[PDB]
Structure formats: C-alpha cells, structure tokens
C-alpha cells in the first residue's frame, strides 16, 4: 500500500514514494534533483518516469495518492504519468 506523495513548491517538483504499512520512504526522484533545472511540466513525466522506475526497483506497483493540499495541476499531471508510465499505479 506504498503511498505517493508529489510535492511541488515553484520551480522544484518532487514526488516521495513512501510505505504506507510502515513509514518507510523508499523512492524519491525530482527533475531539478537530478538535473534537469529546465521546465517543471516538460520534464515532469521524465522525473515520473524515473521516479516510477525508481519505486519499480523496490517493486512499488500501486501507490496510494493522498498529497493532500495539492490541486490536480500540471507538474503532478506530466510527472504522474511517469510515475504511472513508468510502474506505479496510483
């Protein structure tokens, strides 16, 4: 029941694969992390990509999304996506 968390603040996107059985983060991947400082939608789905291919690396199927105060927007769109285009489904 991992639980998914995407935080975006501006200009840095974010997205917190946690274990919602035990408080357990496991995967957490950011575009302006990484790298990429570019744009925050554009890459997003890469960021969710390589988020999904991260939290895949555990085995995190399907995640429990509960960001909480955070309007279905652009960034958690493209870079949900990756994170389900890549493995997880949330």
């Given at each position: 029941?991992?639980?998914?968390?995407?935080?975006?603040?501006?200009?840095?996107?974010?997205?917190?694969?946690?274990?919602?059985?035990?408080?357990?983060?496991?995967?957490?991947?950011?575009?302006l992390?990484?790298?990429?400082?570019?744009?925050?939608?554009?890459?997003?789905?890469?960021?969710?990509?390589?988020?999904?291919?991260?939290?895949?690396?555990?085995?995190?199927?399907?995640?429990?999304?509960?960001?909480?105060?955070?309007?279905?927007?652009?960034?958690?769109?493209?870079?949900?996506?990756?994170?389900?285009?890549?493995?997880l489904?949330?």
């Open positions: 029941r991992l639980r998914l968390s995407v935080f975006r603040s501006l200009k840095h996107i974010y997205a917190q694969i946690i274990d919602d059985e035990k408080g357990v983060t496991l995967v957490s991947a950011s575009s992390a990484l790298k990429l400082k570019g744009n925050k939608t554009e890459v997003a789905r890469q960021v969710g990509r390589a988020l999904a291919e991260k939290a895949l690396a555990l085995g995190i199927k399907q995640v429990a999304f509960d960001r909480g105060p955070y309007k279905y927007h652009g960034r958690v769109k493209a870079l949900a996506e990756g994170a389900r285009e890549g493995g489904e949330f």
